[PDB]
Design a protein around this motif. Structure first.
Motif, short mmCIF file in Angstrom:
data_model
loop_
_atom_site.label_atom_id
_atom_site.label_comp_id
_atom_site.label_asym_id
_atom_site.label_seq_id
_atom_site.Cartn_x
_atom_site.Cartn_y
_atom_site.Cartn_z
N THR D 81 0.80 -1.22 0.00
CA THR D 81 0.00 0.00 0.00
C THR D 81 0.84 1.27 0.00
N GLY D 82 2.10 1.19 0.41
CA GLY D 82 2.96 2.37 0.44
C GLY D 82 3.99 2.37 -0.67
N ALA D 83 3.86 3.33 -1.60
CA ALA D 83 4.70 3.53 -2.78
C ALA D 83 4.74 2.32 -3.71
N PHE D 84 3.75 1.43 -3.62
CA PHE D 84 3.64 0.28 -4.51
C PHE D 84 2.20 0.00 -4.92
N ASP D 90 6.56 -5.48 -11.01
CA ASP D 90 7.88 -5.14 -10.48
C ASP D 90 8.01 -5.59 -9.03
N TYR D 91 6.90 -5.64 -8.30
CA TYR D 91 6.91 -6.20 -6.95
C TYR D 91 7.18 -7.70 -6.99
N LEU D 92 6.61 -8.39 -7.98
CA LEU D 92 6.88 -9.81 -8.13
C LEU D 92 8.32 -10.05 -8.56
N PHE D 93 8.87 -9.15 -9.38
CA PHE D 93 10.27 -9.23 -9.76
C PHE D 93 11.18 -8.99 -8.56
N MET D 94 10.77 -8.09 -7.66
CA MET D 94 11.50 -7.87 -6.42
C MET D 94 11.48 -9.11 -5.55
N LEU D 95 10.32 -9.77 -5.48
CA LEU D 95 10.22 -10.99 -4.68
C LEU D 95 10.94 -12.16 -5.33
N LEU D 96 11.26 -12.06 -6.63
CA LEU D 96 12.10 -13.08 -7.26
C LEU D 96 13.59 -12.80 -7.12
N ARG D 182 19.71 3.40 -7.70
CA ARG D 182 20.80 4.20 -8.27
C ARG D 182 21.09 3.91 -9.74
N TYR D 183 20.87 2.70 -10.24
CA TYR D 183 21.37 2.32 -11.55
C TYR D 183 20.26 1.81 -12.45
N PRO D 184 20.31 2.12 -13.75
CA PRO D 184 19.26 1.68 -14.67
C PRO D 184 19.44 0.25 -15.17
N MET D 185 18.61 -0.12 -16.16
CA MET D 185 18.62 -1.40 -16.86
C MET D 185 18.31 -2.58 -15.95
N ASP D 186 17.40 -2.39 -14.99
CA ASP D 186 16.91 -3.47 -14.15
C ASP D 186 15.40 -3.38 -14.03
N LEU D 187 14.71 -3.20 -15.16
CA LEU D 187 13.28 -2.91 -15.13
C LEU D 187 12.47 -4.15 -14.76
N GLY D 188 12.61 -5.22 -15.53
CA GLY D 188 11.86 -6.42 -15.24
C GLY D 188 11.94 -7.40 -16.39
N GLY D 189 10.80 -8.05 -16.65
CA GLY D 189 10.72 -9.03 -17.70
C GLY D 189 9.50 -8.79 -18.58
N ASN D 191 6.15 -10.18 -20.96
CA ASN D 191 4.91 -10.91 -20.70
C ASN D 191 4.37 -10.67 -19.29
N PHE D 192 4.54 -9.45 -18.78
CA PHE D 192 4.08 -9.13 -17.43
C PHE D 192 2.57 -8.90 -17.43
N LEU D 193 1.91 -9.35 -16.37
CA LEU D 193 0.46 -9.20 -16.23
C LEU D 193 0.13 -7.91 -15.47
N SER D 194 0.64 -6.80 -15.98
CA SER D 194 0.43 -5.50 -15.36
C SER D 194 -0.93 -4.92 -15.75
#
Lengths: 194, 194, 194, 194
Positions: D81-84, D90-96, D182-189, D191-194
Motif C-alpha cells: 500500500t505504500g509507494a507500490f 515489479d513487486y513480483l520481480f523484487m520478490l524473485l 541508483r542504476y538503470p537497466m533493471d526494469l523487469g521481464g 509478458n508481465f500481467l500488469s
C-alpha cells in the motif's frame, strides 16, 4: 460427582476409574494400547474397547488429562440438558457413530490412545449445533462461536504437541453434521428403551 | 520466622537442610535411597533414617516439594496447638510409631523416598481429631473436614508420580488412630523429657 | 547504550560483544571454558580472562543471559551513582578482589562458566551496603532488603537449575563486606589515576 | 479475513499450509531441507523452492514461527500500500530477485530453511524507504525508523538460533536497494500481467 448430573455419567465414571486401575499396578498397561498389528491377524477383542477409556498419566503429562476431562464433563452435559432431552437412543447413536468411525480411521492411521478425538468430536458437534452464540469466552468476552476446536489447535501449536490427535475427530463431527442436516435416512435401529 | 514456634521444628530445619546437601554436591544422592535389598544383605544403617529426610528437587519435581513442605509446616504446629498443648513426649512417640511401621511396609514394597507419606500420615491424624472445621483454604473455604488427605492425594496424583505410596501412609495413620483411641497399653516410653 | 551512563561501561560492552564473536563462528568456543585440568600443567593464560566475559547462548537458555545482563546494568550503575562517586580505584579494587577470589574458588570447584557469581556477588554487596531500605519490589511493594540474592535462589529452586553458580558469589560478597567494615588495612596499591 | 486483501497472499496461504503438510505426516521432513551438496551431485529440483515454504514447528520453536509470520503479513501488505499501489509485476520481480541470490549464498553456506531471511529482506526493503515513521509498536511507539530489522534480528538472536542467516538477508536487501535506486537497466521481464 454422583449427584444425578445427567443420564450418561457412566462414561465419566469409566474415564475417571480406568486410569486409576491402570496406574496403581493391578494390570500392566502393555495390554491397553490398541495395536493394529495385533488386531490384524490375532483377534484380541480387548483393545478397541479398553483403549477408548484409558489415558496414561505421567509427571509432565498431567494437564491434558485434566482439561480433557473438563471438556468432557462441561460439554457433554450441555447436550444432556439441551439435545438429549428425551429420545436418548438418538444421541447414543450419535456417540456410537463417531466412535466406530474414529476407531476405523485409527486403524487407518497408527494412533494408539483413542481418548482425545472423541471429546474433540463431540465438542465440535456441540459448537456446530449451537452456531450464532454471542458469548464464548471470558477474557475476550465477545467471541465468534464454532471456532473453538480450531482455537484448541492454536493452543496445540502454542504447546507444540501434535494435530493428528484432534483433526480426525473435528472432521468426523462435520461428517455427522452433514449426514444429519443435509440428507435423511440416517436413523437408528432396534433395542429402543425410552 | 525461626522464633522457635513449636518444640520440634528441627524436623523442618533438617528437611530443608539435607536436600541442600544433596543438590550441593557433597555426598552423592545414590548413597541416600533406601535400597531395600541392599539393606537386606548388607547392614548399612546409614540409610533407614536419611531416606526420610530427603527429596531430589530439580527439573520438574519442584512444586511438589514446596507444596508438601508448606503443608507439613502448616499442619504440624496446628496439630501441636490443638489437643496437644501438653504431653510432647507422647507426640514424639506418635512421630516414631508411624515411622517404625512405614519403614517395614516400605522395605517390603519398592518405595525409596519416604518423605511424602509420613507428612500425609500426620496430616491424616490431624484430620481424624478435627471434625466440623470447614475453613481450610484462603480461597476454597467450603472444604469439609476429613477431605484434605484425599485432595492432597489428588495433587500428588496429578502433579507427582505414583499413588501406592500415599495410600499406605493413610492406612498407617488410620491404624494408629484406631489403635490409640480405642485400646489401652500404648502409653509410651520411660525416661521421657516431659 | 553508549550515551555516558557511567564510568565502567567497558565491562557491559565486553559482556555484550564477546558472545557475539563466539556465536557467529569466528572462534570455536572450545577454547573458552576455563579448564583447570588444562590450567594445572599447561600454562594457557587465555582461559581465566576469556571465560569471565563469555556466556553460551542456546534456544532455551536465553533468559538467564538477559536477566543477568539486566542485573549487571541495573545494579552496577547504582553503585556508580552512589558509591563510585570519585576515588574509583577503590571500587575497581572491589571488583577485582571478588574476581580473583571466585577464580581461585572455581579452581577449587570445577565450575566452568564464570559470569553468574560475579554479578550475584556485586548484587549482594549492593544489598548489604543498602540495609534498611523500605522499598525493594513492585508487587509486594513492602520488602525487607538484603534478602534479594536468596530470592534469586528461590527462583532458582522454582526453575530447578543449580545453586553452585550463585552461593560462592553470595558468600564472597559477605567476605568482602566483613573485611571492609570490621577491620582496616584492606587498602589499594599503586597505579592511582583519579 | 481472507477477503483478498492484497494480490499476492497465496504466499501467506502456502507458508501456512505446507508446514501442516509437514507436521501432519504425509511427506517426511527430511525430503525438504535443501541439502546443498545433495543438490550439487544429484539434480533434485524438488528442493530449491519447497525449502523456502517450510518451518518445522513443534516443541520449542513455536513462538518464532508465530512472530515471523505475523511480521510477514503485517509488513508485506503495508509495503504494497505504500509507494507500490501500481506496478505489481515489479513487486513480483523484487520478490524473485532476492530469492535468486539468497539461494546461491545459502547454497555456498550451510543454511537449510530459507524462510526467515527472505521475510527480513522484504522487511528491510520496507524500512529503507520508510524513514521518519515512529509509530511502530502498540506499546513502544518511540521506535525510530530503520531500526526494526535490528530488533527482529535481536529477537531471532535471543529466542531462536543462529545469527549468520539473517545478516545475509539484510545484506541482499541492501544490495537490491542500492542496485535499484541508483542504476538503470533493471526494469523487469516481458509478458508481465500488469
Amino acid at each position: 460427582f454422583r449427584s444425578i448430573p445427567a443420564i450418561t455419567r457412566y462414561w465419566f465414571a469409566a474415564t475417571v476409574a480406568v486410569p486409576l486401575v491402570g496406574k496403581l499396578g493391578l494390570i500392566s498397561p502393555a495390554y491397553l494400547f490398541l495395536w493394529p498389528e495385533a488386531f490384524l491377524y490375532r483377534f484380541q477383542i480387548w483393545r478397541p474397547i479398553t483403549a477408548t477409556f484409558y489415558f496414561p498419566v505421567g509427571p509432565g503429562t498431567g494437564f491434558l488429562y485434566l482439561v480433557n476431562l473438563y471438556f468432557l464433563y462441561q460439554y457433554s452435559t450441555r447436550l444432556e440438558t439441551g439435545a438429549f432431552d428425551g429420545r436418548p437412543a438418538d444421541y447414543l447413536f450419535m456417540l456410537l457413530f463417531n466412535w466406530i468411525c474414529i476407531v476405523i480411521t485409527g486403524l487407518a492411521m497408527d494412533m494408539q490412545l483413542l481418548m482425545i478425538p472423541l471429546i474433540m468430536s463431540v465438542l465440535y458437534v456441540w459448537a456446530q449445533l449451537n452456531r450464532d452464540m454471542i458469548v464464548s469466552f471470558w477474557f475476550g468476552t465477545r467471541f465468534k462461536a464454532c471456532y473453538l476446536p480450531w482455537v484448541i489447535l492454536g493452543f496445540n501449536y502454542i504447546i507444540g504437541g501434535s494435530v493428528i490427535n484432534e483433526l480426525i475427530g473435528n472432521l468426523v463431527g462435520h461428517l455427522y453434521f452433514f449426514l444429519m442436516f443435509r440428507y435423511p435416512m440416517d436413523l437408528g435401529g432396534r433395542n429402543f428403551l425410552s
